[PDB]
Amino acid sequence: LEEKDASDWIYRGEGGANLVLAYAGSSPLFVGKVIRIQKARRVLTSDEQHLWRENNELISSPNKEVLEQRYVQNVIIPLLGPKHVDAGVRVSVSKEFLECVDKKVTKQRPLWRVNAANVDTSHDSALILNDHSLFDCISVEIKPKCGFLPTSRFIGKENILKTSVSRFKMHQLLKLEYIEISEESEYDPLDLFSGSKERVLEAIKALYSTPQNNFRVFLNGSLILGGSGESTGRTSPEIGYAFEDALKGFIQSRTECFLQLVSDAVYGSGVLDRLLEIQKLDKLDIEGAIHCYYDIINQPCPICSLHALPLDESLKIVKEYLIAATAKDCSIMISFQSGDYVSPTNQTFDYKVHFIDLSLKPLKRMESYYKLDKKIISFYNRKQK
Numbered sequence: 001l002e003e004k005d006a007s008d009w010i011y012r013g014e015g016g017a018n019l020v021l022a023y024a025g026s027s028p029l030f031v032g033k034v035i036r037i038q039k040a041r042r043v044l045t046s047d048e049q050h051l052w053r054e055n056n057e058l059i060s061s062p063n064k065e066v067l068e069q070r071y072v073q074n075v076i077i078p079l080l081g082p083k084h085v086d087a088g089v090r091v092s093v094s095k096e097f098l099e100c101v102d103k104k105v106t107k108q109r110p111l112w113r114v115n116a117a118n119v120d121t122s123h124d125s126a127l128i129l130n131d132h133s134l135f136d137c138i139s140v141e142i143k144p145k146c147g148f149l150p151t152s153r154f155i156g157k158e159n160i161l162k163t164s165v166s167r168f169k170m171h172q173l174l175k176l177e178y179i180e181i182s183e184e185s186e187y188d189p190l191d192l193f194s195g196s197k198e199r200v201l202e203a204i205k206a207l208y209s210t211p212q213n214n215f216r217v218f219l220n221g222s223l224i225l226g227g228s229g230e231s232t233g234r235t236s237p238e239i240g241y242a243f244e245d246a247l248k249g250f251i252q253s254r255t256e257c258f259l260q261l262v263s264d265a266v267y268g269s270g271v272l273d274r275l276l277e278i279q280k281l282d283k284l285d286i287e288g289a290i291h292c293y294y295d296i297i298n299q300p301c302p303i304c305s306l307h308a309l310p311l312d313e314s315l316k317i318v319k320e321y322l323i324a325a326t327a328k329d330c331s332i333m334i335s336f337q338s339g340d341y342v343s344p345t346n347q348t349f350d351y352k353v354h355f356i357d358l359s360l361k362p363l364k365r366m367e368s369y370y371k372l373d374k375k376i377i378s379f380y381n382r383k384q385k
């Protein structure tokens, strides 16, 4: 892949860690593909090698692309089944390709995403996945987050709100406080993962209203609702109307029909149940896991029973924490086009559900995970009153 192929890629979005471009070309090699490119903010550490030592191919990975590839394949797939997970094929890229591509997209990237990161033009590799906004095609991206309450004996007396109130809902307050969002989200993950149909519908309405970085809709691969590479403001009446109009033809009628159809899809695919069992791989909560983290790296625990545990035990706990970290921050894409089908307008739609962004979380991140958790609850406690 060379500098001149850069033209054949168009901006599609990004998260904290990767840039994503869809193919606008004619090449059979790349039709229906997106290209996923790692960013450098501004291979495995010794402790990681040991943590994930159970998979040897995984920890001998030469670069980060093959790393995520094997992670998903060897650690995640066995857990979520391969029907909705794609580990993505690896492709070679040149420096001038990434540089040029990076030059190209800056214009459509959000400002604070540009301040924080660019493309890591030092990588000689990049991941090619299937464009899930392509089966007319209406795809929907959901970022569910953690859909459960912690229950740990390791959550302090001073933190009696963490077993009652979702981490999402507490985080909304902090986000708002640092001018990262404009108004509190109506979305509640507990509704989405509730495994009740009525309550999934509730969550999907809630997502439509205040989408933030949790909800997005694409027509033939182009954003029609939701922020581009970022969070977006509440859906205003102008937004409502233009999204409504973007629907014509697809929903024979429209917005409420669409949300019902999304709700029925999610629910009847039970794709969120399996995801939830993985998230729940966080059996102790950070307030528990962090102690094990300090044993692992053989550092005296600054935070101070959990320490009386065998290394292998401590290791599996921090391992599964990170694995749940991954499930807690992945996303789901559901493709729609007129056993996996959905049905007033009398239409029946086919649909496909995929997992995206199953990224391996850096072990070092256990420290800032604890720092942030600490910050979330102490800000939520203060507020009540």
Ligand SMILES: O=P(O)(O)O[C@@H]1[C@@H](OP(=O)(O)O)[C@H](OP(=O)(O)O)[C@H](O)[C@H](OP(=O)(O)O)[C@H]1OP(=O)(O)O
Pocket (backbone or CB within 6 Å): 015, 016, 017, 018, 171, 213, 230, 325, 326, 329, 361, 365
């Ligand atoms: O810590 P969280 O729960 O806020 O999750 C982060 C997400 O924030 P969110 O609350 O969804 O707005 C966050 O999303 P944004 O960057 O805020 O769009 C990232 O996806 C981040 O992962 P990473 O930086 O790409 O490795 C996420 O970090 P991890 O928890 O996966 O390490």
Ligand SMILES: Nc1ncnc2c1ncn2[C@@H]1O[C@H](COP(=O)(O)OP(=O)(O)O)[C@@H](O)[C@H]1O
Pocket (backbone or CB within 6 Å): 012, 013, 014, 015, 016, 017, 018, 019, 020, 034, 129, 130, 131, 132, 133, 141, 331, 333, 356, 357, 359
């Ligand atoms: N296979 C795919 N099909 C369609 N869109 C995708 C695909 N992979 C990524 N994207 C788009 O690009 C965005 C960034 O993807 P993601 O893998 O979440 O990046 P990050 O690792 O930075 O969080 C996603 O939110 C999604 O809309």
Ligand SMILES: [Mg+2]
Pocket (backbone or CB within 6 Å): 015, 329, 330, 331, 356, 357
């Ligand atoms: Mg993601």
Ligand SMILES: [Zn+2]
Pocket (backbone or CB within 6 Å): 290, 291, 292, 294, 301, 302, 303, 304, 307
């Ligand atoms: Zn400790």
